[PDB]
Amino acid sequence: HMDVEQLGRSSWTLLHSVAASYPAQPTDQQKGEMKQFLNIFSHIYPCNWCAKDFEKYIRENAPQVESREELGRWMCEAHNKVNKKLRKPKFDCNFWEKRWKDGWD
Amino acid sequence: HMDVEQLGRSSWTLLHSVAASYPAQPTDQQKGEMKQFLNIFSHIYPCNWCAKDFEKYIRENAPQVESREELGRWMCEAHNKVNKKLRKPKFDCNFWEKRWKDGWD
Numbered sequence A, B: 001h002m003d004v005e006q007l008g009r010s011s012w013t014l015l016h017s018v019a020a021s022y023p024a025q026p027t028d029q030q031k032g033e034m035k036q037f038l039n040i041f042s043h044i045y046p047c048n049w050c051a052k053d054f055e056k057y058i059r060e061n062a063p064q065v066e067s068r069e070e071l072g073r074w075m076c077e078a079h080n081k082v083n084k085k086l087r088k089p090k091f092d093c094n095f096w097e098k099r100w101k102d103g104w105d
């Protein structure tokens, strides 16, 4: 059984929350585990076509893990690629921090 | 900002969904990435006390990744440890597959 909407909202909540909690100056270790986290996520995400695309996205636009600001923007753009594919409106990445780090809306 | 309830429900949805999609006979690779996924998750989960505990849980009761049936039960019991800590009722792990693999309730 696949409930792709609830799984999708839940999973974006988790991804954007992890990027909002990420350091502005990450350790070399924090950078490496974030890259691996994201790669593995793309292998095991339980919505099979969802997974492969996001996995090609990670290969063609590698996660930017040098800081919170870069990672958050990266996530916002990864999510917007999926929004475009689904004919949903674009999210203003200028407001990624207001939404996910400060928690407004 | 930390909204631990929505983040928590979202994150359990993702974890139980990944275990429901896991093979009954996983490849050696699938086993290794699941272990690493879970370890990294426990490092980066954005609710700091939540994270450390679950990380000690993974060290004291290592993820059982040999099959879907074992992994799903493991996840159910990991979640029940947190339910106990929060004075929520215990979930019947006998019904883990009905809930998360078949999608009823």
Ligand SMILES: Cc1cc2nc3c(=O)[nH]c(=O)nc-3n(C[C@H](O)[C@H](O)[C@H](O)COP(=O)(O)OP(=O)(O)OC[C@H]3O[C@@H](n4cnc5c(N)ncnc54)[C@H](O)[C@@H]3O)c2cc1C
Residues within 6 Å of the ligand: A004, A005, A006, A007, A008, A009, A010, A011, A012, A013, A016, A045, A049, A050, A051, A053, A054, A075, A076, A077, A078, A079, A080, A082, A083, A085, A086, A091, A096, A099, A105
């Ligand atoms: C990696 C991944 C790939 C997916 N691929 C597919 C797919 O191929 N086909 C499919 O049908 N579904 C896919 N899904 C599901 C889809 O993305 C949506 O989650 C689902 O349709 C639910 O949509 P929603 O309108 O409730 O909000 P969601 O798109 O899940 O958004 C949740 C909330 O995030 C905020 N938000 C929206 N856009 C952004 C952004 N760019 N940056 C930051 N915050 C934002 C908004 O506040 C929004 O309400 C995928 C999910 C994930 C995690």
Ligand SMILES: Cc1cc2nc3c(=O)[nH]c(=O)nc-3n(C[C@H](O)[C@H](O)[C@H](O)COP(=O)(O)OP(=O)(O)OC[C@H]3O[C@@H](n4cnc5c(N)ncnc54)[C@H](O)[C@@H]3O)c2cc1C
Residues within 6 Å of the ligand: B004, B005, B006, B007, B008, B009, B010, B011, B012, B013, B016, B045, B049, B050, B051, B053, B054, B075, B076, B077, B078, B079, B080, B082, B083, B085, B086, B091, B096, B099, B105
């Ligand atoms: C790893 C982790 C650690 C956390 N630690 C804390 C913490 O220390 N303190 C804190 O306040 N919050 C913590 N949270 C949040 C907490 O677990 C809940 O998610 C949150 O309180 C929301 O509760 P809920 O009643 O909406 O349902 P949740 O507990 O999130 O459950 C979601 C749904 O899962 C199903 N379910 C319930 N139990 C099980 C089970 N054993 N197996 C399978 N399915 C089940 C039910 O259908 C339930 O509605 C943590 C979350 C995670 C992911």
